[PDB]
Design an enzyme around this catalytic site. Sequence first.
Site, mmCIF file in Angstrom:
data_model
loop_
_atom_site.group_PDB
_atom_site.id
_atom_site.type_symbol
_atom_site.label_atom_id
_atom_site.label_comp_id
_atom_site.label_asym_id
_atom_site.label_seq_id
_atom_site.Cartn_x
_atom_site.Cartn_y
_atom_site.Cartn_z
ATOM 1 C CG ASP A 15 -6.729 5.574 -1.014
ATOM 2 O OD1 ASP A 15 -7.924 5.838 -0.695
ATOM 3 O OD2 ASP A 15 -6.471 4.865 -2.012
ATOM 4 C CG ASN B 158 -10.942 6.081 0.086
ATOM 5 O OD1 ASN B 158 -11.043 7.300 -0.015
ATOM 6 N ND2 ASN B 158 -11.201 5.251 -0.930
ATOM 7 C CG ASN C 25 -8.603 6.780 -4.266
ATOM 8 O OD1 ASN C 25 -7.682 6.076 -4.633
ATOM 9 N ND2 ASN C 25 -8.930 6.922 -2.990
ATOM 10 C CB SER D 295 -12.022 9.579 -1.890
ATOM 11 O OG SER D 295 -11.616 8.374 -2.522
ATOM 12 C CD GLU E 13 -3.270 -0.610 0.294
ATOM 13 O OE1 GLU E 13 -3.178 0.361 -0.460
ATOM 14 O OE2 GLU E 13 -4.313 -1.319 0.366
ATOM 15 C CG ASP F 173 -13.919 8.505 -5.435
ATOM 16 O OD1 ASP F 173 -13.933 7.289 -5.178
ATOM 17 O OD2 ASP F 173 -13.415 9.334 -4.653
#
EC number: 3.2.1.17
Length: 129
Positions: A52, A59, A46, A50, A35, A48
Amino acid sequence: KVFGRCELAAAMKRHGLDNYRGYSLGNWVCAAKFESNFNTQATNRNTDGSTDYGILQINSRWWCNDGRTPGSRNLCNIPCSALLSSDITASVNCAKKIVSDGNGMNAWVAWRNRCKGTDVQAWIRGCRL
Ligand SMILES: [Cl-]
Ligand SMILES: [Cl-]
């Protein structure tokens, strides 16, 4: 902060993630590895909108507040900035709530695609724990 492998394994054991909800320490180190590459300061955007955050790349759509994810929740009740600390306690406590939400570690796509079904024990092999 960029952790070493055994160094992170040890911090995660102290904070109680060994065997939490049935997942051995190797699954958690393996997940952190892919990760974030053991970097607590990791961030990724991300599609959309959002983002991380931190060593487990939690998230903002659901778990933390960054003031820039319209319509999102903040179920761990923390600013996303606190997931970037060299102390991993916020990331660990939020992970605990996440992995208990029904789908287990399948919530981390990278665990699903790169750790699940592998010899995860090799990620703690050798470590003074
Ligand atoms: Cl393990
Ligand atoms: Cl992946």
